[PDB]
Amino acid sequence: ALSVHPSIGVARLGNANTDNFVLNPMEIGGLPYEHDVDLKPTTTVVNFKDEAGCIRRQGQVFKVFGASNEELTLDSPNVKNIEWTVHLANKKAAWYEFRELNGNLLYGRDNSYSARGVPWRNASKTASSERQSLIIDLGPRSVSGVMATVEISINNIPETYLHPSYPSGELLQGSKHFESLGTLRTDSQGRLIVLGGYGFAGGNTDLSGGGDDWYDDISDGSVTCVVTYSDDSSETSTAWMVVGSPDFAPEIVNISTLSDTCFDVGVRNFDLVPDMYDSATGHYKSDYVANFDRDILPIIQRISQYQWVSNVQSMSGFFSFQFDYRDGSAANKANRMKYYNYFRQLDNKVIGDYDQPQQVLMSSEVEGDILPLMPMNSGSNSVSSSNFYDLTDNVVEKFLALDATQLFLLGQWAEGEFTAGPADDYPVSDMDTASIGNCVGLPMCPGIEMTWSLQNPVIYKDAYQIKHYQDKAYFDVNGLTPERDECEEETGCEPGDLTKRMACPWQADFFNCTIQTVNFSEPSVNKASQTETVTSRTHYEWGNLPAGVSVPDQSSVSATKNVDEKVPLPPAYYSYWWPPQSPWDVLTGELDTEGQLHSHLPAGQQINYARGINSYSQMVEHWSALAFIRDRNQNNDGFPFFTETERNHELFDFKEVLVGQVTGNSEDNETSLPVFFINANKES
Amino acid sequence: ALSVHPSIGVARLGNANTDNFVLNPMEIGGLPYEHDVDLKPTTTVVNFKDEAGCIRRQGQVFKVFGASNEELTLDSPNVKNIEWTVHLANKKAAWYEFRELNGNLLYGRDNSYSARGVPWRNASKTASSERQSLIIDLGPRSVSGVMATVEISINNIPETYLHPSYPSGELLQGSKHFESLGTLRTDSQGRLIVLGGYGFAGGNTDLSGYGGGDDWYDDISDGSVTCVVTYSDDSSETSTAWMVVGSPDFAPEIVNISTLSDTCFDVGVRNFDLVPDMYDSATGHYKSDYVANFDRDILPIIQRISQYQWVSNVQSMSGFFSFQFDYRDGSAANKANRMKYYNYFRQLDNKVIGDYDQPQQVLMSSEVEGDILPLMPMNSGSNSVSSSNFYDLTDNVVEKFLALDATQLFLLGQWAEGEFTAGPADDYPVSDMDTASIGNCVGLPMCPGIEMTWSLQNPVIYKDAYQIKHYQDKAYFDVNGLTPERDECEEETGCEPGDLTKRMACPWQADFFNCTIQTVNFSEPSVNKASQTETVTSRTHYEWGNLPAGVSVPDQSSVSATKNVDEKVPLPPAYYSYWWPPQSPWDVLTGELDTEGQLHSHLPAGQQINYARGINSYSQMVEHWSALAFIRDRNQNNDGFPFFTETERNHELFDFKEVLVGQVTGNSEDNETSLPVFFINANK
């Protein structure tokens, strides 16, 4: 049997020239790679953007291996060809509107999209064929041989692909002309490289209601590899491919990655690690001995990086080594247990059950005993209350937890059931962790690359392996199924299934993936209506009048009533979304005069990552102008210094507003407010 | 034969209690009247608004007279009954979009709505029956007897009227629920009083939205009046008139230089042989031996010009009422003076398509220093808005600057020639009651106007001078309803209800909001607006100095540009020109003389300020028109010594902020000066 790795590939959008790209990271938290003319990885990336300030695509290399785990290439004996067929699609315009956890079958059938009344995107299209044409699907492309290149283009749709679809003609807002979902290549030895979209995002309504008939060039889908041997026999093996938006901080790793997601699903559903979990009973095994370096240390290291992209100082006690994390002894147990007991336990997946650990913000509210519980971040629903969407039992999950496997292992550590030193690897290839370990695992509201369908074991045929629904001959004739939920049918995924739930266009997830102000007093409430009534009596009196003279006072009463229908219920806590993937609080990086003049800031100052992108619509147009957060001291392990690099400072205008301009008091002009923005006009 | 007067009645909208109204002015520039319980006029209006600040409707009294010109009432011997039937309708939503002079057949058949491709309003309705339903038509109502009252309500449509229509249900924006076009009453002796609408303006699209404005309605109307007088012997005679409803007259003592009575009179002279001594119908020329009269013909013009200063800044017109020479001296010695006066008046443009270089495109007497004066009257003409090349046309009709009507100008010319008398002259053969209604409406310019537009200049809608020709009869409309696409000016067979007001803005509050000033180009006769592209190319250079000995750093410089493009703005050089100062004031004097009104208005008395201050958008005018002041003579008891100020403004609606200039400029030294800013909060 052959195997293809990675099992789930990851590419990232880029708007630079089609031929100007980097290759995939080779580890979790790894930089992507420059390459040579043979398309073999060389050194890590020099610049993420080209000279014009356009983002380079990141491509995924896939490799195929024989029965003894030896790599097969066009140079291997007895191999005469290797043909890769990749079928990517974007089903987002054909899917349901995103409503947090509604639609997620892990909470039971009563939380199905139908049971919850979730509406379809582009809801005026109700016939099946009209829904199918909302999908961006240009059919499968194939590549083989030495240094091949084929676009997944609207201009080379195979004649055997009977039902292609895409947004045709000139779009009225955003990107005008859709043309491509990406590019397939082979390297000098026949390996596959998949490159995804270009960052296209356009549509025919004003984003400003608005938002119908919009599209992006995110996609995902199947990978098929046929290796033909000298005698014309062959073997076939498969994988999946996902395209994400750019990784703007690739060295910073999510506390729970999508690799952690796949692993946890694997352990609890596919017997991936029999020693850790008893599939017969549905419980972890309390005699499982964790390993510090493999299981615990990465959590601590991930936590320690968030400071470069967010203000989460309350997490500092978890990477301080204020005591010895490697000491398994009974004398150190109360310390390890205290550390562990500050992590939020997982909520059950029961509808209507609100008083649960992920609705708890703090360890206590007694002064002296107050600490935000860990990890400190939004959960998968801090946005809608129990009573939204005409429901009374909408699922809430306000604050973050680790995944169940991470937390189990952390608890073994706390118990003293762990070792120090090397452990052997789990039975998961490194190539499989290196792709999706660079994608967000939690929270998922919806997420960045993928959302909570990936937590559902029914989409997998085994740990880390996406189950495929049907095959090329089926789709050739029928096209893709717009209304089919792979989580409901359980018989596999189609192209477009892994990304369809995400925002359409993705630049909305990016614009919103910042912070959330999250209520922490009422477990069933995220937002409430708020009425602010201000009643004012103005009284006038006149004086400094002559001794003869008196004038009557005057007074009147005025009131204002401001109603906001859905605001976070106080008291609330400032909570991050995805700092590694959508930075917020970052250090300025220009160390030379020219970059300081154009950015208007000195180096080393913490400022807002998205400053100047003042609207959703501006994010849709100008995403590519943002910085990549990177370690400026990368050559010296252990002494990181992450700053913005490669921001297109020339895009932004700037005004320094004196505080007395706002207040009317000129004494306040000793203080000023920097304001970044994009001049509407503006020309080069 | 009977006659009904006025031939064209005028009522004004009001949102006060249905029972709380004033009666019509009795002369041009006359205040409306309070009335007694018998609905007879008593003395002129005390307050235009009720105690809540709601505007009182103005109703029109109609009287019927016998062959002897004796008034007939229920008290007349031989009169058994007087029965009035009034049919008002609003066809605005069913008519064409207003595009200045497009559609006006006085410019020839090539200027027809169809030749000019003017779109219908609510253009997605194309079937005749669907166009018909856009009309607000509740059928006719009748009234007779002593002190009768009948509403023109959606709840009392006669069963014989088969095709009523109106906007039913709850409107999404503005006024919610349409119910009535007005009220018919009789007085104690059986005279008719017509009261019009309540100021309703609502619709189902967002006015502030792009392309918004479809499916909007107001409660303006107009239509036919029929009077049947039944005598003791049960015989009867019938006679007819017309009725128009306009928006409030916010400065009723201030008269338009050319009123709608002037329009009807001009039409009558030129087309209906109204004054055979003035005009030769056989040759189509005025008679040069006609002797004008100063008091009747000339003086009113001078008096009207002298009032505009209360509502606009038109000081250049001051020489035309200065009596710097004796206007009543008809002698040769004063002729050069008279002629100089006359020669500062614009001659009328011919109405020939494509002929731009004409007198109404000329602003000044010359542009030679010492010889510069704006020609008269100094106001916008009937198209200072759209150029020759708009609306997909190449010869769109332009008329930039105002002229008198042809008859006023002829008479002024006779005065200049010395062909005029001083002293009384006998009236023209037009009833004073017919002048008193429409003499209080705008005659020129019409773009579109206030109460009515340029179809009133078309002789084909009249059956004689001042008399509207009626199309069909009551029975026809009972069965067929109104004809939505029918142009009375095209068919020449008379008017239907709704015809006199349908061309005006829908809602009228758009005409009121726009009826302010125009910045009018005066260099290119074919151009009103142009695109304007402003490109600003800026080199920023930095140098550093005061450095220690031996230290230098390089200069830095870079270049940036902005390109603003405004698509349709006035082409410079342009002139600040008024629209309708008497009917839509712009520069007016504050009027609050006690402390409370000053605190609420935020202004001392006697200061000239903007009339609409605080109504910062079109949508706010639609909602809050009734908050605006009435401009009136505070010194009305003293003939010759006028003092017009605002009165009755609903100051409490508006909020106020004083902005220091250094808030804008960033320079605190500028805070010695401030800018008043009025606005409407809404959360009030």
Q: Taking each helix axis from N to C terminus, what angle separates B335-343 and B406-417, rounded to the nearest 10 degrees?
A: 160
Instruction: Note whether A682 contacts B558, CB cutoff 8 Å.
Output: no
Q: Return the number of other C-beta atoms located less than 10 Å from residue A118's C-beta.
A: 16
Q: Locate tokens 């400029």: which residue?
A: B665
- A13, A199 in Cβ contact below 8 A? yes
Nearest to A554 among B596, B668, B683 (CB): B596
Tell whether A682 lies on the interface with B, counting CB pairs under 8 A. Answer: yes
Distance CA A640, CA A304 (A): 11
Instruction: Note whether A681 contacts B599, CB cutoff 8 Å.
Output: no
Tell whether A556 lies on the interface with B, counting CB pairs under 8 A. Answer: yes
Angle at A351 between CA A348 and CA A357, to 5 degrees: 35
Instruction: Note whether A562 contacts B666, CB cutoff 8 Å.
Output: no
Residues 6+ apart with CB under 8 A from B525: B356, B357, B358, B361, B398, B400
Q: Locate tokens 């009339």: which residue?
A: B611
Strands B136-137 and B71-72: unpaired
Instruction: Note whether A682 contacts B210, CB cutoff 8 Å.
Output: no
Instruction: Note whether A669 contacts B671, CB cutoff 8 Å.
Output: no
Chain A contact set for B656 (CB, 8 A): none
Record the tokens describing residue B539, joined without a space.
Answer: 């080199």
Q: Return the number of other C-beta atoms located less than 10 Å from residue B627's C-beta.
A: 23
**Nearest-CA distance A678 → chain B (Å):** 11
Angle at A649 between CA A644 and CA A655, to 5 degrees: 110
Tell whether A637 lies on the interface with B, counting CB pairs under 8 A. Answer: no
Q: What does each C-alpha distance from B599 to A87, A539, B211, B500, B651 come to in angstroms?
A: 73, 11, 40, 43, 9
Distance CA A369, CA A375 (A): 17
- Chain breaks of chain A after residues with C–N above 2.5 Å: 208
Q: Locate tokens 């069963």: which residue?
A: B159
**Nearest-CA distance B490 → chain A (Å):** 40
Distance CA B562, CA A651 (A): 12
Distance CA B61, CA B58 (A): 10
Distance CA B564, CA B547 (A): 40
- B451, B263 in Cβ contact below 8 A? no
Distance CA B260, CA B476 (A): 30
Chain B contact set for A554 (CB, 8 A): 595-596, 599
Count of residues in chain A: 684
Nearest to A683 among B210, B558, B561 (CB): B561
Distance of CA B276 to the CA centre of its chain: 30
Please name which of A394, A382, A409 lies closest in space to residue A352, comparing C-alpha atoms.
Answer: A394
Instruction: Note whether A684 contacts B561, CB cutoff 8 Å.
Output: yes
Nearest to A683 among B563, B662, B668 (CB): B563
Tell whether B602 lies on the interface with A, counting CB pairs under 8 A. Answer: no
Tell whether A69 lies on the interface with B, counting CB pairs under 8 A. Answer: no
**Nearest-CA distance B212 → chain A (Å):** 13
Distance CA B254, CA B312 (A): 12
Chain B contact set for A561 (CB, 8 A): 683
**Nearest-CA distance B681 → chain A (Å):** 9
Instruction: Note whether A679 contacts B562, CB cutoff 8 Å.
Output: yes
- B382, B399 in Cβ contact below 8 A? yes
Beta strands in B161-272 (DSSP E): 173-174, 180-186, 192-195, 201-203, 216-218, 222-231, 236-246
| Window A:203-222, CB contacts with B under 8 Å | 206
**Nearest-CA distance A516 → chain B (Å):** 27
Q: What does each C-alpha distance from B647 to B14, B595, B619 come to in angstroms?
A: 17, 15, 24
Chain A contact set for B667 (CB, 8 A): none
Distance CA A296, CA B661 (A): 61
Tell me which H or E stretch contains B375: none
Chain A contact set for B683 (CB, 8 A): 560-562
Size of interface A-B (CB pairs under 8 A): 50
Please name which of B591, B676, B682 lies closest in space to residue B628, comparing C-alpha atoms.
Answer: B591
Tell whether A68 lies on the interface with B, counting CB pairs under 8 A. Answer: no
Q: Return the number of other C-beta atoms located less than 10 Å from residue B409's C-beta.
A: 20
DSSP B336: H
DSSP A498: T
Experimental determination technique: X-ray
Instruction: Note whether A684 contacts B558, CB cutoff 8 Å.
Output: no
Q: Taking each helix axis from N to C terminus, what angle separates B260-271 and B406-417, rounded to the nearest 10 degrees?
A: 80
Record the tokens describing residue A208, joined without a space.
Answer: 């400003």
Tell whether B323 lies on the interface with A, counting CB pairs under 8 A. Answer: no
Instruction: Note whether B668 contacts A660, CB cutoff 8 Å.
Output: yes
The DSSP secondary structure of A247-271, one letter per residue, reads: -S-TTSPPSSBHHHHHHHHHHHHS-
Closest CA in chain A for residue B557: A594
The answer to whether the peptide bond before residue B6 is cis (omega within 30 degrees of 0) is yes
DSSP A344: P
Chain A contact set for B558 (CB, 8 A): 597-598
Distance CA B199, CA B201 (A): 6
**Nearest-CA distance B684 → chain A (Å):** 4
Distance CA B519, CA B384 (A): 8
Q: Return the number of other C-beta atoms located less than 10 Å from residue A514's C-beta.
A: 17
Distance of CA A62 to the CA centre of its chain: 22
